[PDB]
């Protein structure tokens, strides 16, 4: 900063947060539920081992991973989640094989005090089944061994083209094989047994399991405990005492000197000239909206994989395009186009903060970065296509294929290329910011914090390394939930708040210090408080008690920093028409209105409805997390990047008219279509399934016996009537930007 002090203080935030990453990966490591060495059966024969568990984990990553269904509730929703259908089916196989050698009959054919005496023998056996003090053994009973090997045949038939199971495979939306080799089936069933055994086993000393008795399961007695509701109400106190103290600290710092700055009659951005490196951004804005159209079309294709079969009113080509591939594409291209629009907006604003001046050979660097981004997208999608089609031996699929985890499934070579592209954009950022801190001035307060936050976003992406493939599941989900604790909570939030502060300072609708306070707030809440909200999702996958104590109180802390609005766009907008050129910026602003609207709809109401764990116990893995994702991601950041897209369209084609009249439809159709496919189809399905999962159980909500009750069948067939409206709105937005590019 003054003597390269502030720029050098960047390493200290990285070091503190990386010590916090190291110390919590250290506790998760070995604080995890253990993979035992070998499955010791009681008769005297051995079973499979950690090599088979690791290779079945790799085979499960090869077939889609969390894009078929889910393990422990995090993932996909149109297939039964492996941890609960296996648990319920293993339980029903055990009751059949326990009624066999005692009565010879079925389960439900017996009376209820007999079912209760077998369930109390079940809780005499399942609440104590461990190793030799993490000694690697099982001591598995032969009755449980015959039950696991009997329910093993079901999943050997679910992926081996069984002709009697077309009533289940496409009804669960898979391709006819999904895994052609037989040892791979034998290892994927061993992996499923381990994940549903680590649920069905109490923790050492305590009476709680390793995943805190994850499904609602009365037949094993999985009722959520006392400290669950205690820490839930503690989290509610933390949420309420966070919002109020932030409003109190905002109100007791809004006491300005009433400066009242006058708005100039022109726009200080358009008064300066245009570099060719600015004029070379039409290709970026084409790639942004091209990937957006690709993403909505793919989304309509997974919509038809949800309602109907794999043939699409003809003959099926889904043998080359399964459900996991189109969901990976929908998920990765969504994150990619949302990130590239903001990356383009940042590289737009970066020379203009520098008085328009540019570094040496800038347009060529912008072009190499552009072709690098298109190359990484196409290679990642080709790797996903080659990996799901089993055109890859199980050795480079982790490196050069679909990795298998939501939002991180890109291959490690393509992840290295994406990290290198983000560092090259970092280079173009420091080449635009440096020249503006080397000048003698007094604006060193906000800009050093902005440098540390941009350095943090990317230099915490060194955490996309430091995990291999052959790792434990929960350690990975600590790291998978570390990614999305910054991939949306970081430079979508913090970058779009500071870019919003730059826009509202240039329009003069902020006091140019509340922007600083907000930026300072949205900076510090994520650089100092960015670690521990991961523990609101890891509490259901391997906590101990001080981990649960930190993760309930210290993970509700991410709710509060969002909205500077309410203090603009109701009074300042009331003071509108001061400047004539605002009629060109009516629509970019409208997006900034809608940004506020789904922030009181996505996270403002449905984010704390689903946050505390006794709420989260019955819903994690149901159709209320996509309710949160769909409303939250396009509802906030899907409008932030198209408002900036629209805004840099009006700043690179100023002579080209923005052609309104259709853009009102493209805006006021997109939001309403998103609200129609969110409030009318997905949320009622989630509440009826939620009522059935608290009534009957978690296994029941994902079964095909329940999802084909012809009410929620017609309600997801009626999902389509808002989706076509959203596609029409997106189509009109796309044609508007293409006609603007001329
Ligand atoms: C309007 C066209 C769209 C369609 C047809 C569509 C389709 C879908 C469907 C069906 C799901 C849930 C799948 C399931 O229940 O298993 C889903 C989830 C999701 N969609 Fe979309 N989508 C669309 C638009 C968008 C947009 C604009 C974004 C953001 C850029 C987006 C990002 C997501 C995300 C992040 C999820 C969460 C998936 C998960 O975590 O399981 N989608 N989409
Ligand atoms: C505004 C920025 C945010 C966005 C864009 C966002 C988006 C998402 C998405 C897409 C998911 C689904 C992850 C998955 O695929 O499994 C998710 C998970 C979740 N979010 Fe957020 N979120 C945000 C902030 C928040 C806030 C502020 C809260 C609560 C205060 C919250 C609570 C949750 C919870 C409890 C889950 C778990 C759902 C699951 O496991 O599927 N999020 N978020
Ligand atoms: Ca998911």
Short mmCIF file of N, CA and C and ligand atoms in Angstrom, two decimals, residues 74-77 327 406-407 480, ligand 3:
data_model
loop_
_atom_site.label_atom_id
_atom_site.label_comp_id
_atom_site.label_asym_id
_atom_site.label_seq_id
_atom_site.Cartn_x
_atom_site.Cartn_y
_atom_site.Cartn_z
N UNK A 74 -26.79 -35.25 0.19
CA UNK A 74 -26.31 -34.12 -0.58
C UNK A 74 -26.17 -34.53 -2.03
N UNK A 75 -27.00 -33.97 -2.91
CA UNK A 75 -26.83 -34.30 -4.31
C UNK A 75 -28.05 -34.19 -5.20
N UNK A 76 -28.34 -35.27 -5.92
CA UNK A 76 -29.45 -35.35 -6.85
C UNK A 76 -30.73 -35.78 -6.14
N UNK A 77 -31.85 -35.70 -6.85
CA UNK A 77 -33.15 -35.93 -6.23
C UNK A 77 -34.08 -36.85 -7.00
N UNK A 327 -27.30 -33.32 -16.10
CA UNK A 327 -27.30 -32.56 -14.86
C UNK A 327 -25.94 -31.95 -14.55
N UNK A 406 -21.01 -32.54 -6.69
CA UNK A 406 -21.72 -31.36 -7.16
C UNK A 406 -20.86 -30.10 -7.10
N UNK A 407 -20.88 -29.36 -8.21
CA UNK A 407 -20.17 -28.10 -8.40
C UNK A 407 -18.66 -28.24 -8.51
N UNK A 480 -15.69 -30.35 -0.29
CA UNK A 480 -16.72 -29.98 -1.25
C UNK A 480 -17.58 -28.85 -0.72
CA1 LIG B 3 -27.18 -31.49 -4.46
#
